[PDB]
């Protein structure tokens, strides 16, 4: 997208979102990042939304194919050939490529230029998320290292968020939500997931009195997601 103006890429990313053209949206936002300037809050959100939609579709497809593959590998199942595994592998490779692309943007050079807490925490949460999606499909000799990379990114983001943001800040809340999902689903640490979700919820509740009506709505929406997980987990 090197020949398109930064502002035009951003405008077209917004149009692609309205048109539900998320691969286009992600390509426009990748082009915008590659202009080399830091991203505003809105631009960071567009980048994140674009890739969450792309990888979300790939993850859902991978789960469908992985379930079919697992069923075909059961006792009393008829041999259907290599096609299910081959196609699951194709989708998996594509998904890994998207995660590597996002991680590459964060490493070159979004994170190193991010000095304010809101940008740095948001980017480190993204880094944790995309390593988490790599971990969901990992099975080889690097699976432990991929898990540790997700954990390390989330932990750095948590440490900053606790020092620099109020307990109701929506980035702080979403980071804690996603880190608790990492603990529950990836790290085999359901008790850590439950403790994190409960403490995050309770500390946010006690800070709601400081907020405007609109900030209250923002924070309580994410708090309800923490509560939904706690209801499923306990």
């Amino acid at each position: 997208m090197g020949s398109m103006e930064r502002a035009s890429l951003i405008q077209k990313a917004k149009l692609a979102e309205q048109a539900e053209r998320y691969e286009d949206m992600a390509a426009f936002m990748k082009g915008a990042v590659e202009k080399g300037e830091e991203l505003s809050c809105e631009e960071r959100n567009l980048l994140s939304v674009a890739y969450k939609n792309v990888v979300g579709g790939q993850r859902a497809a991978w789960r469908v194919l992985s379930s079919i593959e697992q069923k075909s590998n059961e006792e009393g199942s008829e041999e259907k050939g290599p096609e299910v595994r081959e196609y699951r592998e194709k989708v998996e490779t594509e998904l890994q490529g998207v995660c590597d692309t996002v991680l590459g943007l964060l490493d070159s050079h979004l994170i190193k230029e991010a000095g304010d807490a809101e940008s740095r925490v948001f980017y480190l949460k993204m880094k944790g998320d995309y390593y988490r999606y790599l971990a969901e499909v990992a099975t080889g000799d690097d699976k432990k290292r991929i898990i540790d990379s997700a954990r390390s990114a989330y932990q750095e983001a948590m440490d900053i968020s606790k020092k620099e943001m109020p307990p109701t800040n929506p980035i702080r809340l979403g980071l804690a939500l996603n880190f608790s999902v990492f603990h529950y689903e990836i790290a085999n640490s359901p008790e850590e997931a439950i403790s994190l979700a409960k403490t995050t919820f309770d500390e946010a509740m006690a800070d709601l009195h400081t907020l405007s009506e609109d900030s209250y709505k923002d924070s309580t929406l994410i708090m309800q997601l923490l509560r939904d997980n706690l209801t499923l987990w306990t």
Binding site: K14, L177, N229
Partner: peptide, 9 residues
């Protein structure tokens, strides 16, 4: 277990 959907600006 649900993460942030994060799919709408």
């Amino acid at each position: 277990a649900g993460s942030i959907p994060g799919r709408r600006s």
